[PDB]
RNA sequence: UGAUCCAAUAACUUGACCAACGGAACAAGUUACCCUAGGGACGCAAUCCUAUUCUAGAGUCCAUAUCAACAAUAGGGU
Ligand SMILES: Nc1nc2c(ncn2[C@@H]2O[C@H](COP(=O)(O)OP(=O)(O)NP(=O)(O)O)[C@@H](O)[C@H]2O)c(=O)[nH]1
Ligand SMILES: [K+]
Ligand SMILES: [Mg+2]
Ligand SMILES: [Mg+2]
Ligand SMILES: [Mg+2]
């Protein structure tokens with residue numbers, strides 16, 4: 001939640017010298033550099049104006065000619081930055097410190113072709129995305145116990161985010177519990193789609209589905225757990241087809257319910273034969289393809305049931321992916 | 326528009342980029358090889374750009390933006 005935007009303008013060139021024929025210095029260029037220890041919010045509250053202008057090329061003197069280029073401006077940003085344009089096209093990616101990208105060029109100097117005038121520079125507007133998502137991304141409906149699952153899986157974490165799963169080998173698996181996955185995603189692509197843009201940069205997806213189904217209101221449709229999974233798959237297909245290529249695991253929560261066993265059995269039957277029930281949904285709700293789950297585990301966030309096995313399965317799946325790649 | 330002297334002429338008259346123009350009849354460079362007598366240590370305009378301000382207009386919504394015509398003064402060049 002830190003999407004940024006700046007206005008950049010390269011300085012104009014240098015005024016040439018007509019009688020002799022001297023060129024003026026080229027205008028300063030606009031560059032963005034990757035540095036650590038600072039964040040996008042840090043940049044914003046350092047420079048509230050959000051505008052960067054480089055130097056201006058020196059005019060053509062008579063002691064010297066072909067003037068020196070103006071002092072370029074360097075814009076510091078953190079690592080893992082995606083720089084795009086106002087149209088959203090990705091200008092570049094800065095993944096390591098000292099990565100430098102030119103965004104706006106300075107104006108040319110005062111050549112005779114331009115009547116020795118210092119041609120103006122470039123005006124551009126750039127966007128910043130400080131989002132390099134973790135390896136595991138949690139996807140779940142509201143109240144589907146994503147925060148509770150994160151709190152249970154972490155030694156100590158606030159369940160209202162990013163957390164780490166610790167192993168005996170002192171290995172940490174970086175997980176991201178993303179709230180508001182369904183903030184009218186089918187209707188508000190303005191806010192519930194930044195969630196999908198953040199989650200798209202994750203290697204593994206963990207869907208968390210409540211066993212007791214879900215319902216927004218008494219006047220809203222009661223969708224079962226299988227219906228919730230189908231809705232998740234349809235939303236993923238609508239958002240980005242390439243996201244489904246990543247490995248996905250399923251976790252049916254709230255096993256402490258009295259009917260949880262029968263509900264999970266029914267859900268497993270539906271998973272085994274989904275084609276027999278896909279007609280019940282409209283053609284809009286029918287996904288282009290069905291997501292295959294490497295593992296589906298029943299878990300309970302209250303009784304701390306199956307969490308160790310889920311962590312072991314996640315580690316094994318990550319190891320298998322690494323070995324394959 | 327040019328004095329004296331001087332020159333020509335029987336006479337009346339005449340002669341000066343003497344222009345350094347109150348005009349010496351006619352005389353140049355270089356000296357670190359030097360010498361002597363002395364004295365001292367800005368505005369006016371057109372144009373092009375930018376530092377700071379206002380905003381006619383354009384879009385801006387989503388823990389996610391603003392740019393900015395015309396001006397206003399402060400300065401740099403042609
Ligand atoms: N009985 C029972 N209650 C559970 C279980 N898991 C979660 N809960 C309860 O259900 C609620 C979950 O709320 P919350 O932590 O906000 O989950 P969430 O999915 O992150 N909600 P949101 O997506 O809106 O942020 C809590 O009251 C929690 O105690 C479970 O396995 N069993
Ligand atoms: K004289
Ligand atoms: Mg939560
Ligand atoms: Mg005199
Ligand atoms: Mg007199």
Ligand SMILES: [Mg+2]
Pocket residue numbers: 357
């Ligand atoms: Mg000598």
